[PDB]
Design a protein around this ligand. Structure first.
Ligand SMILES: CNc1ccc(Sc2nncn2C)cc1C(=O)Nc1nc(C)cs1
Ligand SMILES: OC[C@H]1O[C@H](O)[C@H](O)[C@@H](O)[C@@H]1O
Length: 448
């Protein structure tokens, strides 16, 4: 081997994870306190989602989801169950998002979103209801309230101009009104993490953390209002959006970061930001693999020294390929077919090396991510008193959900890092739609 030494750079000892855990908890602490909130890399954003909901509206709700690659519009119906509110998606539709909108101005993009909304309401006999609308908007936002806050900055390659710094919900509003076609009561805006968390509440009241491991990666959790300094008040709990994707932007990860991570960064829409998410999320995983594969070929270890034109283009090793290669059964048959598609003609040993390379990146993501989560869960242990903390974490995201063994490595490692917690993991059913709408419903009791 010169291979195993190159791949071994990805490993993390147990003390590595603990270091990142402890540093993350610190950054969480700093994000929450008035003296350090402004400059904290982990912003710890109040969301105005609050504990003891205590009764809500019912009937139909409309939810949008922007921040996945697609954009989704759905109808969710909310009624009364014993536990709290049931809910269920009843109509749905995805809309691609043209790059002439994406490079656009903000108000352009929310016009495109407005067009999609009318389209959906035609096709459904619906233009003539003014519906309450919960909006899952998966980007960092500083809220003033449950229905108002500014975009701090775009992440995950999004770039529409003139949105950073404005009232995202006002954008939505000035597009709906800017096209007469329909009436919509925008009652609530939430992060994906919060929506996921909230949708697990009906079947499990201990769900107090939501986590997304998808294109991007983040979590949110329920904090003690006393510890949330940026919202006056000391009673109860408010869900906080940690935005942990940005941990490492004040150099907290420098010692772990690798030449490949240094290159995914430089070449990205958002250089110097979202460093932690860059090690874990699906927008970056394939690309890390691609760069590891390129270093192996330049070392002559792989495809003996030569790479197709595709292999050399940014973006070509799709994250979904990372997870198909790790599903190969041992016959190389689907490793072969992916490599053959990118214009390579690999040998037996090429296929194995390529698989080793995917394992190395995905195992590191799983481990890095387990340290953030045990950071959050051990912080919650601190504030609390039963001898064993039992807690449920709601999760969503194609990496966590669909990658062949990421979830189990990730569960094994969160559990090493969390003695005397007992953790249940729930994969959210339609977390984002039902979530927005579950919150929307409680927000409505405070307005209509
Ligand atoms: C069903 N909706 C909720 C369920 C639970 C919780 S907190 C909790 N308690 N145990 C676990 N968890 C997470 C909050 C909400 C909620 O929507 N709260 C809102 N407050 C405002 C002001 C608007 S919406
Ligand atoms: O969508 C998953 C996560 O992606 C990136 O972290 C976004 O900044 C975040 O807000 C969202 O929660």
């Amino acid at each position: 081997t010169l291979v195993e030494q190159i791949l071994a750079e990805f490993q993390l000892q147990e003390e590595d994870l603990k270091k990142v855990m402890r540093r993350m908890q610190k950054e969480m602490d700093r994000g929450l306190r008035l003296e350090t909130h402004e400059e904290a890399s982990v912003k710890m954003l109040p969301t105005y989602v609050r504990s003891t909901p205590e009764g809500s509206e019912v009937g139909d709700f409309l939810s949008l989801d922007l921040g996945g690659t697609n954009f989704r519009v759905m109808l969710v119906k909310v009624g009364e169950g014993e536990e709290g509110q049931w809910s269920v998606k009843t109509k749905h539709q995805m809309y691609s998002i043209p790059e002439d909108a994406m490079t656009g101005t903000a108000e352009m993009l929310f016009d495109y979103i407005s067009e999609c909304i009318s389209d959906f309401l035609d096709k459904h006999q619906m233009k003539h209801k003014k519906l309450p609308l919960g909006f899952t908007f998966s980007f960092p936002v500083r809220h003033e309230d449950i229905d108002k806050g500014i975009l701090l900055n775009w992440t995950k390659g999004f770039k529409a101009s003139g949105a950073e710094g404005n009232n995202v919900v006002g954008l939505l509003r000035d597009a709906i009104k800017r096209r007469g076609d329909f009436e919509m009561d925008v009652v609530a805006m939430v992060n994906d993490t919060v929506a996921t968390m909230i949708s697990c509440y009906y079947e499990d009241h201990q769900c107090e953390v939501g986590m997304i491991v998808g294109t991007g990666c983040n979590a949110c959790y329920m904090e003690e209002m006393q510890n949330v300094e940026l919202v006056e008040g000391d009673e109860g709990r408010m869900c906080v959006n940690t935005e942990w994707g940005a941990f490492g932007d004040s150099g907290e990860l420098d010692e772990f970061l690798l030449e490949y991570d240094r290159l995914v960064d430089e070449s990205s829409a958002n250089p110097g930001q979202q460093l932690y998410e860059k090690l874990i999320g699906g927008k970056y995983m394939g690309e890390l693999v691609r760069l590891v594969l390129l270093r192996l070929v330049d070392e002559n270890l792989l495809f003996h020294g030569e790479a197709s034109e595709q292999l050399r283009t940014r973006g070509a090793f799709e994250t979904r390929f990372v997870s198909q290669v790790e599903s190969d059964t041992g016959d190389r048959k689907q490793i072969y077919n992916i490599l053959s598609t990118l214009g390579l003609r690999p040998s037996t040993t090429d296929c194995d090396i390529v698989r080793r390379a995917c394992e190395s990146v995905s195992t590191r993501a799983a481990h890095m991510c387990s340290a953030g989560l045990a950071g959050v869960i051990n912080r919650m242990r601190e504030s609390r008193s039963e001898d064993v903390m039992r807690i449920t974490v709601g999760v969503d995201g194609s990496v966590y959900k669909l990658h062949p063994s990421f979830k189990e490595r990730f569960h094994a490692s969160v559990r090493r890092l969390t003695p005397s917690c007992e953790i249940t993991f729930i994969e959210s059913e339609e977390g984002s739609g039902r979530g927005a709408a579950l919150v929307s419903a409680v927000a409505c009791k405070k307005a209509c």
